[PDB]
Design a protein around this ligand. Structure first.
Ligand code: CL
Ligand code: CL
Ligand code: CL
Lengths: 8, 107, 100, 8
């Protein structure tokens, strides 16, 4: 996870 | 810089997130429409901007080093690529962590 | 390129890999003699040679190669090999050394 | 799986 991005 | 991804039609340089969203919106908002851009502040990092279900999502691509070899990843090293071209070519056929395939270069 | 050995047999692939050391990650790709439209990835792991079938497939008119019935798809054998030099996938180890 | 091969 990366804050402000859609990675999951 | 003269990295190979700079020869690719999906690479748009240092455009902003809002810019990428306008550019993708102007080209139809078609599913799988995508581009790759440089991060405005992450050293050597990139962002994959992708359209799915009329919504533009953004996936951070970060560099990392394993021993002395560099690789790029969107998932903290679960899936690793030597360069952005290998990452993009993989995700044209495999969804991976993405909600759909990369289908059309935004240009 | 240098990892592709054409239409050699399984026993020959094992002899070639043994002759070069039986090192983990040593591999070659050969045309399958028992599946003419397929290929075999022959790989050394833990002082043992294993063989992985690569089969072609079509979805929506798009051709691809896969070792796992389309869960992971590749446009060509080079892309499959390059992916597995960094990612294990279904393989027990990474592809590290090309077998001459 | 595929008979005669090590795919898993
Ligand atoms: Cl968030
Ligand atoms: Cl923003
Ligand atoms: Cl065989």
């Amino acid at each position: 996870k990366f804050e402000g991005y859609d990675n999951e | 810089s003269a990295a190979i991804h700079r020869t690719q039609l999906w690479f748009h340089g240092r455009i902003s997130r809002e810019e990428s969203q306008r550019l993708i919106g102007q080209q139809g908002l078609v599913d799988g429409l995508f581009l790759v851009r440089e991060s405005q502040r992450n050293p050597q990092g990139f962002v994959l901007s992708l359209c799915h279900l009329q919504k533009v999502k953004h996936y951070l691509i970060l560099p990392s080093e394993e021993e002395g070899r560099l690789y790029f990843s969107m998932d903290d090293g679960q899936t690793r690529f030597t360069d952005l071209l290998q990452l993009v070519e993989f995700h044209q056929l495999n969804r991976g962590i993405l909600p759909c395939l990369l289908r059309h270069c935004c240009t």
